[PDB]
C-alpha cells in the first residue's frame, strides 16, 4: 500500500517543484530573450566562424573562440563548446545556448568585480542589460574604468550618467551602439531597440501519512542526510524525463527553502506538499501523476510501465514485488491498472 503512495507522492512532488517556480522561469526566459535581441542588434548573430574587428575568430553573438590566428584552433574550441563536429557552422539554437552561457559568465564576472557589483545590484532588469552589453563590448576592466558614470548610475542620476557616458572614447569609437545603450540606461526601457526588429520583441496529519511522506522524501534524499540538494533534485527530475538546467533546479530549491539554508529538509517538503496550487484541482494532480505511470498513454498502467517508474524513482523492488503492486491495485482483474483503479489506490 505504502509502495504505491510513496511513488505517487514523489511523482507529485516532482510536479510541484516544477509548478511552483514556473512563473519565475517565464519571467527569466523573457528577460533572456530581451537581452538576446539587444545584443543580437548590437553584435549580430553569425552562424559561421568570422573574424571580429580585432581580427579574432568568433561566432554566434560575439562569442570569441580564440585569439590564436589559427582557424583550426577556432574550429576545435567551437567543437568543444558545442559538443559536435560543427565544421565552423552552428544553428540558431546553438548560438542562443552559447549566448546564454556568455551572459551567465558576464554576470559572474560583474559580481566578482568590486567596482561593478554594487552598480549592477542597484540596477533594474533592463538597465542591468545595458551594463552587460558594455561588458560584452569591452570587458569588465574596461567598464570598471567608467568610475564617475557608474556612481551616477548607482545613484539613479540617469540624465547626468547619460551626458557623461557620451563623453567617452567608447561613444566616439561606436556611437550608434553607445547611443542605444545610453538611452537604455537613461530611460530604463527598450525604446532604443524596439523599432529595429519591427516591434516584435521586448513584450493536522496522521502517523501513517507522515510515514509515507518521509518515504517519498527519501527517494529525493538518496544519501539520507535529511536534506534535498539541487543535485539530488536534478537526479530525480532527469530519471523522470526532465532536463532542467542547474539554474532552474536552483530556483526550484530556493522557492521551497523557507529557512534559506540552501537545501530542503523534511518540514519544508511537507509544507510544499500542503500548499494550495494555482488552478490545479486535486483530481488534476492524480491525473497528472497517472500520466507519468502510464508512459504510453493507453489508459492502463502495465507491470512493465510500473517497473520503469519504480526504477526511475529509485524505489528498489523485485519484479515480483512490482507484479504484486499491480495485483493489489487491480479491481477488474485484467492485470493492469486503469485510472479509476489508480484513484481508488491513492484515496485510502
Ligand atoms: Ca566615466
Ligand atoms: Ca540529501
Ligand atoms: Ca532549508
Ligand atoms: Ca500504458
Ligand atoms: Ca484493472
Ligand atoms: Cl534602476
Ligand atoms: Cl557628481
Swiss-Prot record:
Pfam families: Phage_lysozyme. Transmembrane segments: none annotated. GO terms for cellular component: host cell cytoplasm. Optimum pH is 7.3. Its EC number is 3.2.1.17. Changing residue 149 to V: 50-fold decrease in enzymatic activity. It comes from the Viruses. Its main location: host cell. Changing residue 62 to F: Almost complete loss of enzymatic activity. The enzyme is destabilized by 1.5 kcal/mol. The active site is at residues 43, 52. Belongs to the glycosyl hydrolase 24 family. Endolysin with lysozyme activity that degrades host peptidoglycans and participates with the holin and spanin proteins in the sequential events which lead to the programmed host cell lysis releasing the mature viral particles. Once the holin has permeabilized the host cell membrane, the endolysin can reach the periplasm and break down the peptidoglycan layer. This is Endolysin. It comes from Enterobacteria phage T4 (Bacteriophage T4). The lineage of its organism: Viruses, Duplodnaviria, Heunggongvirae, Uroviricota, Caudoviricetes. The gene is E.
Amino acid at each position: 500500500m505504502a509502495r504505491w503512495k510513496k511513488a505517487f507522492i514523489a511523482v507529485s512532488a516532482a510536479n510541484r517543484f516544477k509548478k511552483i517556480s514556473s512563473e519565475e522561469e517565464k519571467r527569466k526566459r523573457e528577460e533572456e530573450e530581451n537581452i538576446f535581441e539587444m545584443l543580437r542588434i548590437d553584435e549580430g548573430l553569425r552562424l559561421k566562424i568570422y573574424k571580429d574587428t580585432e581580427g579574432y575568430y568568433t561566432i554566434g553573438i560575439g562569442h570569441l573562440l580564440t585569439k590564436s590566428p589559427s582557424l583550426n584552433a577556432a574550429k576545435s574550441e567551437l567543437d568543444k563548446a558545442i559538443g559536435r563536429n560543427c565544421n565552423g557552422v552552428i544553428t540558431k539554437d546553438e548560438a542562443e545556448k552559447l549566448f546564454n552561457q556568455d551572459v551567465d559568465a558576464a554576470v559572474r564576472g560583474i559580481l566578482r568585480n568590486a567596482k561593478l557589483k554594487p552598480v549592477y545590484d542597484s540596477l533594474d532588469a533592463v538597465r542591468r542589460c545595458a551594463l552587460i552589453n558594455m561588458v560584452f563590448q569591452m570587458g569588465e576592466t574596461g567598464v570598471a574604468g567608467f568610475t564617475n558614470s557608474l556612481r551616477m548610475l548607482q545613484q539613479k542620476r540617469w540624465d547626468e550618467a547619460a551626458v557623461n557616458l557620451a563623453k567617452s572614447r567608447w561613444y566616439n569609437q561606436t556611437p550608434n551602439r553607445a547611443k542605444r545603450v545610453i538611452t537604455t540606461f537613461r530611460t530604463g526601457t527598450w525604446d532604443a531597440y524596439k523599432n529595429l526588429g519591427e516591434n516584435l520583441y521586448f513584450q493536522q496529519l496522521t502517523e501513517e501519512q507522515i510515514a509515507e511522506f518521509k518515504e517519498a522524501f527519501s527517494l529525493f534524499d538518496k544519501d539520507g542526510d535529511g536534506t534535498i540538494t539541487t543535485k539530488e533534485l536534478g537526479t530525480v527530475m532527469r530519471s523522470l524525463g526532465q532536463n532542467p538546467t542547474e539554474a532552474e533546479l536552483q530556483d526550484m530549491i530556493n522557492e521551497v527553502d523557507a529557512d534559506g539554508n540552501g537545501t530542503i529538509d523534511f518540514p519544508e517538503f511537507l509544507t510544499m506538499m500542503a500548499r494550495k496550487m494555482k488552478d490545479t484541482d486535486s483530481e488534476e494532480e492524480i491525473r497528472e501523476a497517472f500520466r507519468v505511470f502510464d508512459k504510453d498513454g493507453n489508459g492502463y498502467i502495465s507491470a512493465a510501465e510500473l517497473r520503469h517508474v519504480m526504477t526511475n524513482l529509485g524505489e528498489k523492488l523485485t519484479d515480483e514485488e512490482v507484479d504484486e503492486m499491480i495485483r493489489e491495485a487491480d479491481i477488474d482483474g485484467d492485470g493492469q491498472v486503469n485510472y479509476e483503479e489508480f484513484v481508488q489506490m491513492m484515496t485510502a
